[PDB]
């Protein structure tokens, strides 16, 4: 019932800039933080962002602090991730999620959209 | 203005309830976490209960657990306190208060609504 | 050394209602929160209420918020879910859990029990 | 001495901007979280914006989200409070202050800095 | 009534200990995190340290940090700090203090104890 | 890019003592709490202490407690367990882990260093 869908990923240049949404439905959406979770090939997920349920809050992980702006609308149940100066290291699956003792199992998170950064 | 209007209180007698309410106006309700703060006479304010800005987490002090219940209606801008099997050392001026990073200063609470528990 | 061992699941009805227990022994119970993860057929777990050492805060996801309550009594080292109004999408295997970066690793979970909603 | 110097404050037309600085010694600043405090005429101090000891982690009141953006160099020991879109309501001696469990007294806050907010 | 005492102040020399001792009652001490609380001459109160209701987490003020140590006895409702390497500068009135969402209104604190250190 | 590197494992009699060391690079080591994970034979992991990033704070499984100690300097940017009064249920794989919304995935932690307690 809880879904969570992306949309915003695909190929884009060193440097360039990209925004992912990610739509949620089934659970009040200003009720719960929110984060984006990165997978890089073979390597294991990792929070990278995340954002309170009113949007008062946001923690950033080293890797994406200064690039990179989580944000949502309530009003419009979506939550964002502005990513800027993007680099190679970005490459990967990005997916969000909903919090949880940290974020929820991996059963609930989006669909999965992959960000590729190539010249 | 950020506004807190109390109301609810009066005169019980011991073992009676009470339903205290809270309006709020001024700031986005369900953003913030929200307390009941007592003021017994002669007493320091102490804060007897805590819900989250959902309303999906609530707090309660020892002196109030099992007996009061704090809910919140986000569609109104309504916090509540249920108070039953209620006794003379619950006779207080109640507030209700915004978190700050814990509670609010004392300017933003109500003008508060004094319950008096007596035979 | 840790153990959780759950009691009181079964068969119930559509909008019955039924209370889950958790015995726990091998740590001071009142030293850690607790809380119960919902595993339905074919879906990830999921934490679905939580309550602090003392019992003095409980939180509740918004698919049980109204309908369960998480209690327990550190006299009786045991915790409880009183499970109301249950429904067809409540049928699940009911796990308990001490609480850990969020919750501890499945191997350390009550042993399962499982709920089943059939008129 | 825990020591810390605010300034940057002054005279601004409503729309206009300002930066307001806060210099920290006496303690290592890194270790701290740090709010921004207002204090404006006739009102109770109300913290508007906390960052985290890292800076990885931010948090903006309601009245000052989408104009405020707090920030620190820990390198430098000084913290910052980016004003925008200020109007007459932001008028008020602006103060840091290190997080205690929650804000630290007020005597160990600044002298302050006035910002005054007019035509 | 809740009620908090302090005692094992004193006199002491510079680099000597003392251990501060504060005894609880009216209240499940275990359900309650608690602090120590700092007020020197002419200074605001500053709490120094904080340990969980179990026991199990603990916190030190930078000023403090590895020479005193707070610990906690439940079953005999005692909170205790092992002050050493005592310096002039840790002259002051001691007072234990129930977590509130952050620190309990003074109100609340003991009558305190006299720590002096002197040649 | 981040790497966390554990040394100091190895055999230990019964009653011994044995200081684990987890050196840290590719990011600001003082930015994030850390934690000792273990890891018996056959067992889930577990999160037997955990540090804040400043050194402030530490936190301790019941397990441990009493015996254990978790420590870092960050100007040498490593983090250490000081275990003591080895048992022969200490007997496990430890990992160094950064937090995360509780740790990160195991991907991230330490390459893990056994600890063998036996006569």
């Known amino acids: 019932e809880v879904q969570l869908v992306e949309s915003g990923g695909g190929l884009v240049q060193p440097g360039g800039s990209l925004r992912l949404s990610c739509?949620?439905?089934?659970?009040?959406?200003?009720?719960?933080?929110?984060?984006?979770v990165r997978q890089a090939p073979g390597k294991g997920p990792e929070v990278?962002?995340?954002?309170?349920?009113?949007?008062?809050?946001?923690?950033?992980?080293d890797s994406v602090k200064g690039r990179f702006t989580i944000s949502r609308d309530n009003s419009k149940n979506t939550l964002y991730l502005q990513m800027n100066s993007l680099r190679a290291e970005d490459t990967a699956v990005?997916?969000?999620?909903?919090?949880?003792?940290?974020?929820?199992?991996?059963?609930?998170?989006?669909?999965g959209t992959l960000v590729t950064v190539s010249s | 203005e950020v506004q807190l209007v109390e109301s609810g209180g009066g005169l019980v007698q011991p073992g009676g309830s009470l339903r205290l309410s809270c309006?709020?106006?001024?700031?986005?309700?369900?953003?913030?976490?929200?307390?009941?703060v007592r003021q017994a006479p002669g007493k320091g304010p102490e804060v007897?209960?805590?819900?989250?800005?959902?309303?999906?987490?609530?707090?309660?002090?020892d002196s109030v657990k099992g007996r009061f219940t704090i809910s919140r209606d986000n569609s109104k801008n309504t916090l509540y306190l249920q108070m039953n099997s209620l006794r003379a050392e619950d006779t207080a001026v109640?507030?209700?208060?915004?978190?700050?990073?814990?509670?609010?200063?004392?300017?933003?609470?109500?003008?508060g609504t004094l319950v008096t528990v007596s035979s | 050394e840790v153990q959780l061992v759950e009691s009181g699941g079964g068969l119930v009805q559509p909008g019955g209602s039924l209370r889950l227990s958790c015995?726990?022994?091998?740590?001071?119970?009142?030293?850690?929160?607790?809380?119960?993860v919902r595993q339905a057929p074919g879906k990830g777990p999921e934490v679905?209420?939580?309550?602090?050492?003392?019992?003095?805060?409980?939180?509740?996801?918004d698919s049980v918020k109204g309908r369960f309550t998480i209690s327990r009594d550190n006299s009786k080292n045991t915790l409880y879910l009183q499970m109301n109004s249950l429904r067809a999408e409540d049928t699940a295997v009911?796990?308990?859990?001490?609480?850990?970066?969020?919750?501890?690793?499945?191997?350390?979970?009550?042993?399962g029990t499982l709920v089943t909603v059939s008129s | 001495e825990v020591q810390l110097v605010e300034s940057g404050g002054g005279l601004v037309q409503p729309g206009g901007s300002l930066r307001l600085s806060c210099?920290?010694?006496?303690?290592?600043?890194?270790?701290?979280?740090?709010?921004?405090v207002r204090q404006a005429p006739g009102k109770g101090p109300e913290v508007?914006?906390?960052?985290?000891?890292?800076?990885?982690?931010?948090?903006?009141?309601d009245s000052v989200k989408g104009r405020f953006t707090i920030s620190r160099d820990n390198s430098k020991n000084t913290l910052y409070l980016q004003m925008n879109s200020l109007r007459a309501e932001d008028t008020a001696v602006?103060?840091?202050?290190?997080?205690?469990?929650?804000?630290?007294?007020?005597?160990?806050?600044?002298?302050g800095t006035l910002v005054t907010v007019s035509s | 009534e809740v009620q908090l005492v302090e005692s094992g102040g004193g006199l002491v020399q510079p680099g000597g200990s003392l251990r501060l001792s504060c005894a609880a009652s009216?209240?499940?001490?275990?359900?309650?995190?608690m602090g120590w609380v700092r007020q020197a001459p002419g200074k605001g109160p500053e709490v120094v340290s904080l340990?969980?209701?179990?026991?199990?987490?603990?916190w030190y003020d930078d000023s403090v940090k590895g020479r005193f140590t707070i610990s906690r006895d439940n079953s005999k409702n005692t909170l205790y700090l092992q002050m050493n390497s005592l310096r002039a500068e840790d002259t002051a009135v001691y007072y234990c203090?129930?977590?509130?969402?952050?620190?309990?209104?003074?109100?609340?604190w003991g009558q305190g104890t006299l720590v002096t250190v002197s040649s | 890019e981040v790497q966390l590197v554990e040394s100091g494992g190895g055999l230990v009699q019964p009653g011994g003592s044995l200081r684990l060391s987890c050196?840290?690079?590719?990011?600001?080591?003082?930015?994030?709490?850390?934690?000792?994970v273990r890891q018996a034979p056959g067992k889930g992991p577990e999160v037997?202490?955990?540090?804040?990033?400043?050194?402030?704070?530490?936190?301790?499984?019941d397990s441990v407690k009493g015996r254990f100690t978790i420590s870092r300097d960050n100007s040498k940017n490593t983090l250490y367990l000081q275990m003591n009064s080895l048992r022969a249920e200490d007997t496990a794989v430890?990992?160094?882990?950064?937090?995360?919304?509780?740790?990160?995935?195991?991907?991230?932690?330490?390459?893990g260093t056994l600890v063998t307690v036996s006569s």
């Open positions: 203090a129930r977590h509130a969402p952050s620190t309990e209104a003074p109100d609340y």
């Open positions: 340990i969980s209701g179990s026991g199990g987490s603990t």
């Open positions: 009216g209240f499940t001490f275990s359900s309650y995190a």
